Amino acid sequence: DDFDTRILEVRNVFNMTAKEGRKRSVRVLVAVGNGKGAAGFAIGKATERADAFRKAKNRAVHYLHYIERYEDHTIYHDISLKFKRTHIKMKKQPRGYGLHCHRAIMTI
Amino acid sequence: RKPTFMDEEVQNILIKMTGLDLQKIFKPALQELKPPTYKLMTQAQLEEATKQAVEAAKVRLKMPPVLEERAPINDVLAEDKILEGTETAKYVFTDISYSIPHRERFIVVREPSGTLRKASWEERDRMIQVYFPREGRRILTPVIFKEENLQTMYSQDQHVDVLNLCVAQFEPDSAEYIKIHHHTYEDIDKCGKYDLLRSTRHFGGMAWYFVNKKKIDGLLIDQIQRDLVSDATSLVHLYHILHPXXXXXXXXXXXXXXXXXXXXXXXXXXXXXXXXXXXXXXXXXXXXXXXX
Numbered sequence A: 001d002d003f004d005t006r007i008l009e010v011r012n013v014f015n016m017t018a019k020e021g022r023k024r025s026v027r028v029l030v031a032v033g034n035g036k037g038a039a040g041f042a043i044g045k046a047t048e049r050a051d052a053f054r055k056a057k058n059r060a061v062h063y064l065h066y067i068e069r070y071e072d073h074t075i076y077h078d079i080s081l082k083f084k085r086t087h088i089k090m091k092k093q094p095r096g097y098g099l100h101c102h103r104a105i106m107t108i
Numbered sequence B: 001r002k003p004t005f006m007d008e009e010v011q012n013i014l015i016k017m018t019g020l021d022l023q024k025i026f027k028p029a030l031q032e033l034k035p036p037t038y039k040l041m042t043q044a045q046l047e048e049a050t051k052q053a054v055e056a057a058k059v060r061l062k063m064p065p066v067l068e069e070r071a072p073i074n075d076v077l078a079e080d081k082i083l084e085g086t087e088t089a090k091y092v093f094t095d096i097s098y099s100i101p102h103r104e105r106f107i108v109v110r111e112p113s114g115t116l117r118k119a120s121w122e123e124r125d126r127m128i129q130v131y132f133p134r135e136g137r138r139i140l141t142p143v144i145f146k147e148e149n150l151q152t153m154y155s156q157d158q159h160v161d162v163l164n165l166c167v168a169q170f171e172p173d174s175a176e177y178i179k180i181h182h183h184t185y186e187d188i189d190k191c192g193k194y195d196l197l198r199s200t201r202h203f204g205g206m207a208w209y210f211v212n213k214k215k216i217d218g219l220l221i222d223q224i225q226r227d228l229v230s231d232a233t234s235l236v237h238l239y240h241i242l243h244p245x246x247x248x249x250x251x252x253x254x255x256x257x258x259x260x261x262x263x264x265x266x267x268x269x270x271x272x273x274x275x276x277x278x279x280x281x282x283x284x285x286x287x288x289x290x291x292x
Helices: A049-061 A103-107 B008-018 B043-061 B121-131 B147-155 B159-169 B175-190 B203-211 B217-225 B229-241 B247-254 B259-269 B274-291
Strands: A004-017 A021-033 A038-046 A079-083 A086-090 B076-079 B091-094 B107-110 B115-118
Touching (some): A004 A049, A004 A103, A021 A049, B008 B203, B008 B229, B091 B121, B107 B121, B147 B159, B147 B175, B159 B175, B175 B203, B175 B217, B203 B217, B203 B229, B229 B247, B229 B259, B247 B259, B259 B274
Antiparallel strands (some): A079 A086, B076 B115, B107 B115
């Protein structure tokens, strides 16, 4: 009951089926966390989007990371990280400075 | 004799009385924060850093000068009655010259009365505050020094703040300075809150105003209850330095003196409530025989 989930990205994805012509799937990328430092995310995909929200929920509890927080708010030290054509950079702030981030990263 | 705050005896005794608390000395402040700086140190480097801290804390801890009151200065430099009929409201002439000590500045006035008068003290100060703006100072006196606001700030146990407010706003020899400092001491006394200003730079003012008000009560009681003997010792020592000739002084000195004998003889010879001292001076004593 402690785990909140947020939908990061819902997307309409298509395929080519000999029978049907186009075939429409929905894929949602979803994250989950308790606020206490452990959290994770997963992808899920289904024909009906409701189904897919469900799928990502459950699969995401299965991958959790523990995220270590300094004095239980910031990160410990600056992080500059290049991952696959995307660069992430994050500075460790003091207390009055709430969450200045990409909207996704705020959510996470 | 010549005792005063700036004497070495009074100084070293009041520094020792005050105490170094690096937590209360350096405490979180409300200013816009910056991200914290980190470095890895040896035992040695941490010790040297610690001493560095203590050194710098002393400077933070330096006592605000206590001084006697200033008398009103009334002197007229000239009179021409011919000007009087101009019936114009007051003119205020200040000198602003960057070399000058602000007690050596010349501040003058011409009233509608056609006379050349020197500026009064309050007047003089608010003038210098206009042309030499210094932070924290209002040029018109801040409301908070009304009795209501005073009591409100005392309730909130903010007394360090008030005493920090007067240091900046008024002048150490002023009337208001003295009124507020002293009244504030009266409050910590009637509330027994003395340990507030303990690691503060304000402690010197606590000690003095009381030795000269000859009520050492709460501070001695508290010191013995806080399990500090040496402080009560140097404090009676102080009452002896600011009162050399009295029964208590010369008798409880020349007879013999140390922790037990001088603190208890000055507990018998200062009668405000000697029953309080004698009670607590027993308790600490008892709490020794159990701990040793």
